[PDB]
Amino acid sequence: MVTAKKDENFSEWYTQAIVRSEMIEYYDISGCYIMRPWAFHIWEKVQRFFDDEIKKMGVENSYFPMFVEVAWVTHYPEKIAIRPTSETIMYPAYAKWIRSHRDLPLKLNQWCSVVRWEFKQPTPFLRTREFLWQEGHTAHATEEEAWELVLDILELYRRWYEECLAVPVIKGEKSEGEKFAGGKKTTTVEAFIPENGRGIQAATSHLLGTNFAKMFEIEFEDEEGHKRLVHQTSWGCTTRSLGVMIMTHGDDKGLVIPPRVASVQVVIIPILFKDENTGEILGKCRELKTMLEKADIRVRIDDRSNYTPGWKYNHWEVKGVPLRLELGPKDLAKGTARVVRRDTGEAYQISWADLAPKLLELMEGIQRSLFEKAKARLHEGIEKISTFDEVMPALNRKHLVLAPWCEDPESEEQIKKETQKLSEIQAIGAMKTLCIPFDQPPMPEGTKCFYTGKPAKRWTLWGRSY
Amino acid sequence: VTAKKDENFSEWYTQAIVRSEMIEYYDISGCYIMRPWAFHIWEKVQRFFDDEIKKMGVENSYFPMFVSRHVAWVTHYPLPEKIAIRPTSETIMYPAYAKWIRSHRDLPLKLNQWCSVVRWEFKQPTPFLRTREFLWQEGHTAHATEEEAWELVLDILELYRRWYEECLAVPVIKGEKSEGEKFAGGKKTTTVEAFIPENGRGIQAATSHLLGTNFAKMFEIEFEDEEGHKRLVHQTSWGCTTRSLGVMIMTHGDDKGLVIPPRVASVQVVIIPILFKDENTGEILGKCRELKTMLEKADIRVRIDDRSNYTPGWKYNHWEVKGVPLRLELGPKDLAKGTARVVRRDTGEAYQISWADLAPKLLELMEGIQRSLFEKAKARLHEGIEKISTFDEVMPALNRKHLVLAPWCEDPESEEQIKKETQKLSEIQAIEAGAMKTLCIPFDQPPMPEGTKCFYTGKPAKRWTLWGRSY
Ligand SMILES: Cc1cc(N2CC[C@@](CO)(C3CC3)C2=O)cc(C(=O)NCc2cc(F)cc(-c3cnn(C)c3)c2)n1
Ligand SMILES: Cc1cc(N2CC[C@@](CO)(C3CC3)C2=O)cc(C(=O)NCc2cc(F)cc(-c3cnn(C)c3)c2)n1
Ligand SMILES: O=C(C[C@H]1NCCC[C@@H]1O)Cn1cnc2ccccc2c1=O
Numbered sequence: 001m002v003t004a005k006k007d008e009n010f011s012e013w014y015t016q017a018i019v020r021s022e023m024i025e026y027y028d029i030s031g032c033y034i035m036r037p038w039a040f041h042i043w044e045k046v047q048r049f050f051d052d053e054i055k056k057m058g059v060e061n062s063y064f065p066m067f068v069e070v071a072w073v074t075h076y077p078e079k080i081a082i083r084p085t086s087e088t089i090m091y092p093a094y095a096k097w098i099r100s101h102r103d104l105p106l107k108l109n110q111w112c113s114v115v116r117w118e119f120k121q122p123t124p125f126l127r128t129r130e131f132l133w134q135e136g137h138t139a140h141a142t143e144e145e146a147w148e149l150v151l152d153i154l155e156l157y158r159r160w161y162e163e164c165l166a167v168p169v170i171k172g173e174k175s176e177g178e179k180f181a182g183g184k185k186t187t188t189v190e191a192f193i194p195e196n197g198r199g200i201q202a203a204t205s206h207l208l209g210t211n212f213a214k215m216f217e218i219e220f221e222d223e224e225g226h227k228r229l230v231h232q233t234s235w236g237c238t239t240r241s242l243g244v245m246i247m248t249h250g251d252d253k254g255l256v257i258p259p260r261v262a263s264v265q266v267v268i269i270p271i272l273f274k275d276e277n278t279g280e281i282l283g284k285c286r287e288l289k290t291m292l293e294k295a296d297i298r299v300r301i302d303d304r305s306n307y308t309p310g311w312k313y314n315h316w317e318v319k320g321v322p323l324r325l326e327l328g329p330k331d332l333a334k335g336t337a338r339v340v341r342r343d344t345g346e347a348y349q350i351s352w353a354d355l356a357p358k359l360l361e362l363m364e365g366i367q368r369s370l371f372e373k374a375k376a377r378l379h380e381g382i383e384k385i386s387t388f389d390e391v392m393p394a395l396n397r398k399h400l401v402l403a404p405w406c407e408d409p410e411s412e413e414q415i416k417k418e419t420q421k422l423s424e425i426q427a428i429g430a431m432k433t434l435c436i437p438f439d440q441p442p443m444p445e446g447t448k449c450f451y452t453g454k455p456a457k458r459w460t461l462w463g464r465s466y
Numbered sequence: 467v468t469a470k471k472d473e474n475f476s477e478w479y480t481q482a483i484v485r486s487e488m489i490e491y492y493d494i495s496g497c498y499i500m501r502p503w504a505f506h507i508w509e510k511v512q513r514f515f516d517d518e519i520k521k522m523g524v525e526n527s528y529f530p531m532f533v534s535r536h537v538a539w540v541t542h543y544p545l546p547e548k549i550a551i552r553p554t555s556e557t558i559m560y561p562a563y564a565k566w567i568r569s570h571r572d573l574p575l576k577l578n579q580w581c582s583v584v585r586w587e588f589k590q591p592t593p594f595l596r597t598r599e600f601l602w603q604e605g606h607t608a609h610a611t612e613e614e615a616w617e618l619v620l621d622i623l624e625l626y627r628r629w630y631e632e633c634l635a636v637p638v639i640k641g642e643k644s645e646g647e648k649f650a651g652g653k654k655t656t657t658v659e660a661f662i663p664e665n666g667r668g669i670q671a672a673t674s675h676l677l678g679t680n681f682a683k684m685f686e687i688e689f690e691d692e693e694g695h696k697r698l699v700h701q702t703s704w705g706c707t708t709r710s711l712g713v714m715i716m717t718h719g720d721d722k723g724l725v726i727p728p729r730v731a732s733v734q735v736v737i738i739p740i741l742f743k744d745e746n747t748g749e750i751l752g753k754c755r756e757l758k759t760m761l762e763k764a765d766i767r768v769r770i771d772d773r774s775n776y777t778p779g780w781k782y783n784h785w786e787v788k789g790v791p792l793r794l795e796l797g798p799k800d801l802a803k804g805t806a807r808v809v810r811r812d813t814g815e816a817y818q819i820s821w822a823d824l825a826p827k828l829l830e831l832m833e834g835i836q837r838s839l840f841e842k843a844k845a846r847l848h849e850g851i852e853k854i855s856t857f858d859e860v861m862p863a864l865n866r867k868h869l870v871l872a873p874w875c876e877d878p879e880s881e882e883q884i885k886k887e888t889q890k891l892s893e894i895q896a897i898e899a900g901a902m903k904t905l906c907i908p909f910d911q912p913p914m915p916e917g918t919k920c921f922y923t924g925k926p927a928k929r930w931t932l933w934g935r936s937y
């Protein structure tokens with residue numbers, strides 16, 4: 001079981017939660033972690049969802065080799081690099097494959113692993129040296145088609161997070177300082193970790209435009225015979241989502257997994273003690289499983305002989321199975337069963353004939369409530385502000401600030417440095433742009449930038465970050 | 467596609483997989499770009515096999531790709547220790563196995579992963595089939611008994627057989643491997659074997675190992691049984707690769723190009739409207755789109771090729787090289803009569819079908835295609851194996867691009883010296899104007915007479931073993 005409290009030692013809470021749920025296992029080489037099945041299941045679930053969705057958009061999956069903060073092979077010619085990202089590997093193929101408008105749009109995606117070999121200290125799931133992800137890359141005849149694909153993908157990532165992991169996130173555009181180098185515009189979804197006040201980027205959807213197109217000479221001819229440059233997008237998202245899910249829904253007893261990505265939604269734990277009604281208990285469990293699976297609920301019966309009922313309670317609690325269904329001899333005479341829901345503890349006595357509808361209802365209810373609570377904590381962690389004097393208070397309450405900004409990059413860099421210096425004084429760490437939210441709250445006519453006094457351009461979300 | 471399969475096989479293969487837009491070539495030779503037309507097949511069998519092993523209790527994971535010294539090696543970020551990239555994951559996993567297994571309560575442990583591996587040999591690569599980087603899955607289990615582990619490897623091998631026969635329509639022989647060719651460090655290796663008739667070679671489709679306890683002993687993977695005695699776990703491993711893809715292509719290709727079994731084809735039915743460039747009015751494409759939704763209701767993977775700059779015949783050739791099994795032609799005369807012309811890629815036969823009749827007939831065809839593609843291949847299999855009885859007969863059968871089913875003593879020095887002699891003899895013929903190893907020892911052992919002798923020593927022959935040249 002898990003000792004530490006989420007809200008006072010967050011770090012050791014997090015690692016107890018991911019280790020004692022058999023999600024992670026540690027490894028020789030720092031910043032690599034073994035992803036055990038209990039996590040891999042969730043990843044498979046979100047993978048299936050995103051893959052179905054992007055296949056509906058006409059994206060096709062592919063595999064490009066891993067050879068081309070970078071890592072280099074030495075011996076067994078030339079040095080070979082391991083892909084940090086595969087722009088450099090894919091785009092020459094793109095330049096060869098595209099020659100006329102009749103070959104656009106071209107939309108490829110790949111699920112693979114990448115290596116980003118930073119020497120700072122890792123955080124499992126969140127900042128690792130090898131992570132699993134997807135990366136998609138499209139080229140279009142026009143910029144407007146490309147942009148709408150950027151936004152369609154960003155909406156998928158919203159769903160990936162909100163709809164599947166019940167994690168609330170913010171759509172926005174990245175500042176010039178923090179956008180992708182040599183992209184034209186970088187959109188993003190951003191999450192919030194309330195326990196340390198930090199923001200974290202959840203996924204990216206870049207509008208590359210034509211910069212790569214000309215570096216790599218990816219060109220096509222329209223219906224006139226004139227060769228134009230293609231407009232490109234790339235986008236991707238990683239196992240970091242799992243981490244953000246954990247930190248969003250964990251409590252002092254361990255994980256809490258939203259039903260939509262839980263591989264076991266209902267665990268049926270039989271109470272056996274002193275050989276009382278063992279055969280009937282086990283029969284009823286198997287019948288309840290049959291019935292619940294007929295309603296497409298994912299059921300496991302923990303009928304393992306070598307474990308105590310109370311051990312099973314705590315085992316599936318810490319693993320975060322959303323619904324536990326206890327069945328013993330009393331309930332055999334009653335035709336009901338006790339169901340405990342992992343997110344609140346509440347118990348219910350449900351009739352067997354009512355299990356399937358009722359359990360479905362409970363599961364929808366759990367998912368929604370995980371999301372709504374989470375969404376609440378997010379919008380209560382966002383302090384809108386007018387002046388820079390209001391920044392450090394909010395930072396110390398572990399919140400983000402939403403302020404008017406003039407949007408020039410020197411603004412951001414000196415804000416970064418100044419807030420890190422102030423942090424170091426108070427300790428005797430920096431605050432950066434998180435994003436420029438799509439949903440722009442009202443901007444009065446005369447409003448001035450919260451740092452420079454210059455005329456404001458847009459509302460911008462700032463805070464400490466990963 | 468210009469080259470002719472029966473004549474220049476290697477140039478045939480290269481053209482077939484390049485002009486079908488399966489592979490694209492790359493700087494680093496040994497590593498290829500797998501484009502959608504092929505990766506979809508990989509996705510289809512990946513899903514099949516993954517569903518099947520999940521229902522057996524196997525669960526997926528991901529281990530890292532880096533194993534450290536305590537094979538290709540990576541040095542500079544200046545490194546403290548050269549780290550390698552996994553060629554296989556036994557050494558990355560089995561320490562974790564040692565840590566996670568303590569009691570019989572923890573058994574069985576069944577894991578699996580879908581990853582890429584890197585085996586960096588300096589001999590020349592052949593795409594899909596022998597690459598320096600390839601996608602695979604590798605599964606690793608551990609059991610309390612020996613019989614449990616055995617049962618699981620035979621079950622996995624059955625799954626491999628389906629993967630080849632049921633999905634790719636590629637027939638394969640379930641066999642056991644010589645102790646000379648068996649996994650070093652394994653106790654008994656089982657395999658499925660395939661046969662390329664154009665170069666007469668055998669090839670290892672997938673393998674399923676009975677590792678026994680040797681790895682358990684090396685890594686200290688022990689459990690206490692119910693009586694409290696510390697015991698070694700019995701382990702299995704097993705793997706399959708994108709080589710399946712290669713085997714499939716070769717198995718079914720003809721002079722026009724690929725032929726992809728309907729069960730794994732990304733496009734099962736391609737709809738080619740007959741618009742001879744020019745104006746292109748809405749009347750034709752309209753019907754095609756309706757037909758598409760009509761067909762997708764019945765779960766058919768459909769594509770309309772409406773690219774304006776090409777002639778119907780060009781498209782015909784394009785999709786024939788890509789190997790799509792059914793081609794649906796919709797022209798103005800077809801529109802007038804309310805029908806469509808379907809022609810199967812395998813035999814070239816054409817059918818005129820009403821639109822009502824379109825969904826069932828197509829499905830009845832695809833089955834027909836699937837089945838036929840298999841059984842033809844199966845015969846080309848049985849016609850490649852000659853049941854000889856003395857060593858005198860082997861060179862006439864291997865120069866016939868065959869494999870032979872000879873009775874054998876099962877003595878490993880026999881194997882190594884038959885390899886030596888078949889190369890030598892092989893070389894003299896080459897000079898006048900290659901080695902033959904054992905492929906497997908089959909499970910369907912035919913009748914064995916009392917005191918039949920072996921085909922190379924004269925000793926009492928143990929079992930019928932299948933030999934040929936190979937990859
Ligand atoms: C799992 C993952 C995801 C993403 N990102 C970035 C992109 C994005 C955004 O959503 C997604 C693709 C679109 C995502 O997931 C970035 C990293 C990462 O930079 N890893 C290297 C590393 C290793 C290490 F041990 C420590 C640190 C480190 C950095 N600062 N400090 C204080 C420590 C970094 N890793
Ligand atoms: C795709 C793939 C699959 C398998 N294996 C083996 C096992 C099996 C069988 O089912 C499956 C996993 C269990 C399978 O598919 C083995 C290789 C491979 O050894 N690659 C290295 C390489 C690169 C190269 F350029 C040349 C050569 C080479 C070797 N001899 N010559 C004349 C050239 C070898 N490659
Ligand atoms: O990876 C990206 C941008 C997009 N490229 C692939 C599609 C999704 C992805 O967000 C940003 N980035 C991040 N880190 C690096 C480290 C070394 C080399 C290149 C990079 C590098 O390019």
Ligand SMILES: O=C(C[C@H]1NCCC[C@@H]1O)Cn1cnc2ccccc2c1=O
Nearest residue numbers: 553554555585604605649673703704705
């Ligand atoms: O990979 C295997 C046996 C099984 N191990 C993983 C599951 C499926 C697979 O057949 C055999 N082999 C083959 N080639 C190597 C090259 C370098 C290092 C180790 C190996 C090595 O071990």
Ligand SMILES: [Ca+2]
Nearest residue numbers: 148149151152
């Ligand atoms: Ca849109």
